[PDB]
Amino acid sequence: MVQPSLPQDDTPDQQEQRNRAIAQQREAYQYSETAGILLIKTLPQSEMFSLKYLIERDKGLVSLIANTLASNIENIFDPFDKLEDFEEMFPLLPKPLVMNTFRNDRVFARQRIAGPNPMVIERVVDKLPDNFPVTDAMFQKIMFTKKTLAEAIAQGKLFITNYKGLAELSPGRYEYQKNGTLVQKTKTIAAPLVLYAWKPEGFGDYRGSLAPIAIQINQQPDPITNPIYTPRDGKHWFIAKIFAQMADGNCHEAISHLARTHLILEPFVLATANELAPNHPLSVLLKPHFQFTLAINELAREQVISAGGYADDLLAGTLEASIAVIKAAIKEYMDNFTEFALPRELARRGVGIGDVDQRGENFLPDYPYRDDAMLLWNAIEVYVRDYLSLYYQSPVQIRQDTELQNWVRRLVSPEGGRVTGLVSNGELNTIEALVAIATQVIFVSGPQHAAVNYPQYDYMAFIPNMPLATYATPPNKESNISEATILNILPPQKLAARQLELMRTLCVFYPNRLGYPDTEFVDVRAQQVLHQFQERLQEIEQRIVLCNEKRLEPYTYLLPSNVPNSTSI
Amino acid sequence: MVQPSLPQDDTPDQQEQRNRAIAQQREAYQYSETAGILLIKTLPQSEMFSLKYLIERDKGLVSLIANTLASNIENIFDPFDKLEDFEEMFPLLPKPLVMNTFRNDRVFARQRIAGPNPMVIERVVDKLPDNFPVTDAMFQKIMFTKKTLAEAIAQGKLFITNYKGLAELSPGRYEYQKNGTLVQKTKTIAAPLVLYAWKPEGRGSLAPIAIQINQQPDPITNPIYTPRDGKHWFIAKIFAQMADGNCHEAISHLARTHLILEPFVLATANELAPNHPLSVLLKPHFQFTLAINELAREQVISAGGYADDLLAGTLEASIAVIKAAIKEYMDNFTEFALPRELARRGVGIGDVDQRGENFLPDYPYRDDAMLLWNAIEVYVRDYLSLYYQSPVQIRQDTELQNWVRRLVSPEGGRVTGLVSNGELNTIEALVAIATQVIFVSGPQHAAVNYPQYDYMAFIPNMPLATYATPPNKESNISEATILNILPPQKLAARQLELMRTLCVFYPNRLGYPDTEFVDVRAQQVLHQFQERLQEIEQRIVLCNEKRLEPYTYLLPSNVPNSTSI
Ligand SMILES: [Fe+3]
Ligand SMILES: [Fe+3]
């Protein structure tokens, strides 16, 4: 229980102790890589999960044993017999909230702003992509209007999810034994473009809602082999949405979840261990938000991104392709770190709080993720500022903090995370910059990972709403579509069971709670700051309850009581 | 990396250092109790499972999800439709070794000497129990002989498993919804007596002679069944096995491996400095023990836990049996050393006839366990000799005396049979204590833990509970009668899940600690121990080539360094 202090304010003996501890930690937290991803070489036992954690996780897994025992699904690579079978997969589990309404277009579109991956939709500016040949005829026939695409774009009414990031995926393979021989099959890759429109009148009331307009399943347009489907296409439209959802799933797990929550946090935990003394104010601020992060990332290394792991069996591409996408997302995030602060990232997609019309209202008024996440971001920013100002009163202390300077230097180094977009002028020089960095790290570890992790069961544990891979080509636009066609597009029984398995263990419990660390701060000032953070969190909780009373569907994933303190599951 | 030293040989500064560490450890390893069982209050994070352990355990649980997915067993309290269904529960799991031959009487009897619970059989002396009215007529008709019971007992040919310990169990209950109504049913308990004989003719082997399912005899409602009884004999074995299962899990496994080790780990933390030689000797053999005992508290002996759902009695009754076993073990600690324990059941190495031959020549647990016991004894004698030159160092070791005092205290384990004269005074006494602790943590827990899948994951061979009364001796027995006696589908699935989880992997290996001894001499002691373990492995392989069935559970390769699963 030592009072935290900057290293340039300690006696030479105290400095010797700090360097001793830092050297020991460097011995314990050594840098390693798997397939070019920065991980820890050996997990320190003090960084393992707790007994409490293990008890909860075990409860989840045993619940999966029981639910499997009560289920009728079989251990086969055959498709299901009936679509209804997908709804009989939860005899002893909660029913995923999306199950009943997933066919509705508004429920399909709302997942762009309140589903597991609210990170893709962007407002169209100037024009649609030239490989997305949507015409005025299509837009008018779907919207039942005389307005043109150009006029709608001029009014900020059109939005788009472009999944070109998945275009270069190599399709995943799978094989099994049937009738004594080895059958080998290949998944189907899709990189769709989806045009949505904001409807202020909505679907028959005074609630404005997002409405899907068009879906091109792949990137290169062709009127016969890759047409533009619309809600007027019936079953084909349905199939189109499936593929779109599949795309959204992959981007969700590779980019939004694994890359930009779990894996980008790792170099920060490791840098904290390698450059900051135990009694350094920054380490004491951040370590509560790193609890179990190294451990859960080791579990991801062993069980998710490993050969035969979840990403291998479930995702669209081969394990190699998926890891390529993950690494590209990590690299883009690290190169432009400060640009991925929540306000700037929302603005860059044209759906920030400042993307308003002439009347002063947002082009996308219904965006629960944006609003709640903004509340959490501002609260965390105030908490971080008030905390760090207790130990940094003038920027010269920032510049003369040797441990903090080595922290930044380790982060931006090629072997320490390659975070080249972390600081300006090649150095950390101001207090506000550190405030922004810590705010973003804490926001990612808690709020962001909550928002991308916990909708996974409600939207991705019911397989037809968001299958992680599709298993048949998109039928020709003129072909007849039977139930067996859709059943062959959706995953076979074994892989659907694996997807449910994954989504259940990832959402089964909350390892900790935002703003409630295990050990309180030795500094009574800091503990007061923590308390006011908790009070503001209660205020935010009540405000979000109030918002949920008037929203179309409640958005519960960013309530402070549902947000972990760290990325830990 | 500090050289180990006795606490009275250190400088005053070093002494206050040891007292500091010991005080800190006392706050971290605080004593607690669940239902009168001594456990730890809060598990120190340093005592948690490692990441590797968690990876292996997760592989096991996922294997259970996959095996369940491929199975046709349902989540119902109905019995199975076919007996054959019990053999179809392992589509993606190893088939249990006992599955094919469990109906054979010799396979039934040989589990007393090489099954999961080789701790019950005892040689009959003088006479059978008076509540077990086996006659000369029965014995002669079974053995096809003219010899009497008295002559067989005089020759040491008769052995017995007396499950009187289960007689006072309150039967367990279970309830479930069926057509909008709550059905409530009760398990059937049994406390059988089983008479075996050593048949030298046959390789000689044990042969079951008689089974009385309950303790109080009655020719109508509790007769003495024999192999001549056909179906009824079969049922009489089921109940017997059920008994042997309960005694196995309550007494042999939970009580006398997992739970009796806990006070020793906690005493080591509460009274010994980190650089104390005894702590450095024992802590490798305590790895994950506190953690796995916490998992037992949460998942095994808890309401709705495994013991609640699977065992014969209520959770209260099972915990009563567990606590009685712990108390008898601690009260008579020295008497439960392997040679003495075998001698008290008349099946030790010294229980020989006039020819010098053992009355029970086929006892793989005894032979292999004796090898391991002697090896460990030499190991800890040569280890402790490096630090205890004369017994006055034993008497003047304050941390060790506080260790003993904590162990025998009523709130620290109540190990009243740990020490003579109320004090630890000699070196050899400590050698026997450490020998027994290390033997229990590794060899014993291996021998009772790892046959669990091969004999208890196939439910009909050893059901942890029976779900119908023994049929009348004259009534007809259909497949449905047996299926109603055996556990319903859901509880059979639960039993398989438990055994598989307990036998998936080996968390560590006997004689191979994670961190070496900082003392070079101690590393020589350990190296010698490892060489002896190699020799023992070869000897046991040789013996397994000559035995009827191999006995692999006490091979040094297969024995963990601690009780950790
Ligand atoms: Fe996660
Ligand atoms: Fe065990």
Numbering used by the authors:
A (entry chain A): 1 to 569
B (entry chain B): 1 to 202, 207 to 569
Cite, word for word, the article reporting this structure.
CspLOX2 is the LOX with the highest relative amount of bis-allylic product reported so far, hence it is a suitable candidate to study the molecular basis of the dioxygen positioning at the bis-allylic position. We demonstrate the importance of an active site clamp around the pentadiene system, which fixes the pentadiene during the reaction resulting in 11-HPODE formation.
A key residue that is located opposite of the iron ion and hence likely restricts the space in the kink region is the highly conserved Leu304. In case of 13-HPODE, Leu304 and Leu502 are rather facing the side of 13S-HPODE formation, while Leu506 faces the side for 13R-HPODE formation.
